Amino acid sequence: ATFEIVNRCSYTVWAAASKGDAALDAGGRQLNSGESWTINVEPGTNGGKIWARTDCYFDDSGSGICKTGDCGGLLRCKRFGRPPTTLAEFSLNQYGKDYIDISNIKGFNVPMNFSPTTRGCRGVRCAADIVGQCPAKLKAPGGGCNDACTVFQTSEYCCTTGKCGPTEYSRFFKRLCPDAFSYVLDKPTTVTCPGSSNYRVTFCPT
């Protein structure tokens, strides 16, 4: 499957793509404002994610640091990124269908649209100014809006036992972005697409 990753932000981002224990395609690349990077993701990839990283520095070897979304200091990510990260999440070719969503469970750094480029389903979007409107206690001093689990490390925020409810903090993310997951047990906003669909992830869609 193809994923065209498009940076519409006015700032550079370093795109990342991983399924947690491995890179997808090259795993990461710099995207200046306006640039597009097309990746190939193997059919059947389960639990893949794409995200933006901000304010990165990399040496000649591809080692360094990002202020949001850092994946072990690598340009080419092999693992998931450090919160806060808005997440485009997908599982492909799962009993004949693809499943896509956006999540704010690991916080928010960059606004996102995640849409099919092929027929048969709708896109999802989280494009509100979550960083600007972020509750004081959630603001990440390194940049972005943290989720409550990251900040407070409680069973209720992290849904550790599988029995958690919405919270004042999850309701903030849900109010700004109704079509993204706000907490682990949120009413799902996952979209079913035809198996083997192709996609575009656009940072800063509006």
Swiss-Prot record:
GO cellular component labels: cytoplasmic vesicle
Cystine pairings recorded for this chain: 9-204, 56-66, 71-77, 121-193, 126-177, 134-145, 149-158, 159-164
This protein's record includes keyword Transport: no
Annotated localization: Cytoplasmic vesicle
Keyword set, alphabetical order: Cytoplasmic vesicle, Disulfide bond, Signal, Taste-modifying protein
Major subcellular location class: cytoplasm
Pfam families xref list: Thaumatin (PF00314)
CDD domains: TLP-P (cd09217)
Transmembrane regions listed in the UniProt entry: none
SUPFAM superfamilies (UniProt xref): Osmotin, thaumatin-like protein (SSF49870)
Free-text function comment from the UniProt entry: Taste-modifying protein; intensely sweet-tasting. It is 100000 times sweeter than sucrose on a molar basis.
Family: Belongs to the thaumatin family.
Protein name: Thaumatin I
